[PDB]
A and B are shown apart, each in its own frame.
Chain A
Amino acid sequence: YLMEGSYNKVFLAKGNIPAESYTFFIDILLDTIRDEIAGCIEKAYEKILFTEATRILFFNTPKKMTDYAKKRGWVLGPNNYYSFASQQQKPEDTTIPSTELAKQVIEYARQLEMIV
């Protein structure tokens, strides 16, 4: 269930620990999900108020959300998570082919004319 996107059914299994305590293990599984959602809060989302993505992990309203909202972006505003969905800087690169393909075209002429 951690392989696909499913997160709720993961914590339904954190409602279902049958065998022994398993306490130190699921708390690391808490922690490696906490940065994962704090990772996956950074997708193309709109304005979210301080209730919806405030309850996507577990928490009601502590200052723990300010720990996440000052770790990454989605700036603390008037009940708002600001979206810096830019993804604009990287394209229009002719040079990266123009360095790499000029290597590759010579490699075509190596195994074309000269005897090997």
Chain B
Amino acid sequence: IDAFRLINANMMVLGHEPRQTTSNLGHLNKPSIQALIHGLNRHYYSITINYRKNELEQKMLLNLHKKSWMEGLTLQDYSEHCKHNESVVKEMLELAKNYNKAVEEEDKMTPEQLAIKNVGKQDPKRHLEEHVDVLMTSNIVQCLAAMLDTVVFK
């Protein structure tokens, strides 16, 4: 955004600076250099804006955009969830073998050097705490939702 409005080029010949600042409210936003290449500030000026929000509109767009209907009251493909519970763990073994590798070449060349040098091949340590978040929220959400169906549905 940043709407603009012209300034007279008559005052440019006079060398006179317009708009006679009486409040510390105008010079808050800094103009971009690419707009400063153009006619700002020799032919037009910026104007600070805000937005008119109101509760007549605010609530009726928040509570209506992303509402999940009955998704978490499901079981998520019950033969395949435990199948996917091995589709991660199997390569998580070998990704821990890398974690059984990368720790072993420490007390070595000053691990700031182990920051530059590890941009070619994958590391365990970040990738290994990755799947643990995946292998938890996929399990804890699915195990809990199974045990609320047993009470509510008879």
Decide if A105 touches B136 in the complex (CB within 8 Å): no
Residue A115, interface by CB 8 Å: no
Q: Does the CB pair A94–B144 fall under 8 Å? A: no
Nearest CB of B to A111, in Å: 12
Complex interface: chain A residues within 8 A of B151 (CB) = 95, 98-99, 102
A105 and B150 contacting across the interface, CB-CB below 8 Å = no
Question: Counting CB contacts under 8 A, is B147 at the interface?
Answer: yes
How far, in whole Å, are A109 and B133 apart by their CA atoms in the complex? 12
Report the interface size for chain A: residues with CB under 8 A from the other chain: 12
Contacts of A105 in B (CB 8 A): 140, 143-144, 147
Q: Please tell me if B64 contacts chain A, counting CB pairs below 8 Å.
A: no
Between A94, A102, A109, the greatest number of chain B beta carbons within 10 A of the residue's beta carbon is seen for A102
> A26 at the A/B interface (Cβ < 8 Å)?
no
**Residues of B in contact, count (CB < 8 Å):** 8
DSSP majority for the A interface?
helix
Chain A, range 73-116, C-beta contacts under 8 Å to B: 94-95, 97-99, 101-102, 105-106, 108-109, 112
Q: How far, in Å, is B143 (CB) from chain A's closest CB?
A: 6
Q: Give the distance in Å from the alpha carbon of A90 to the alpha carbon of B151 in the complex.
A: 18
Check: B109 CB closer than 8 A to any chain A CB: no
CB pair B148–A102 under 8 Å, yes or no, is yes
User: In the complex the two chains form, is A102's CB within 8 Å of B147's CB?
Assistant: yes
How far is B141's CA from A109's CA once the two chains are assembled, in angstroms?
A: 10
Which residue of B is nearest A100, CB measured? B147
Interface centre among B140, B147, B150, B151 (most CB of A within 10 A): B147
Q: Report the Cα distance A71→B143, complex, angstroms.
A: 48
CB pair A95–B140 under 8 Å, yes or no, is no
- Chain A residues, CB < 8 A from B150: 94-95, 98
**A109, B147: Cβ atoms closer than 8 Å:** no
Which B134-154 residues have a C-beta within 8 angstroms of A?
136, 140, 143-144, 147-148, 150-151
Given contact pairs A98-B150, A99-B151, A108-B140, a sample of 11 additional A-B residue pairs in the complex whose CB atoms are under 8 Å apart: A94-B150, A95-B151, A98-B147, A98-B148, A98-B151, A101-B147, A102-B144, A102-B148, A102-B151, A105-B140, A106-B144
Interfacial residues, chain A to chain B (CB-CB below 8 A)? 94-95, 97-99, 101-102, 105-106, 108-109, 112
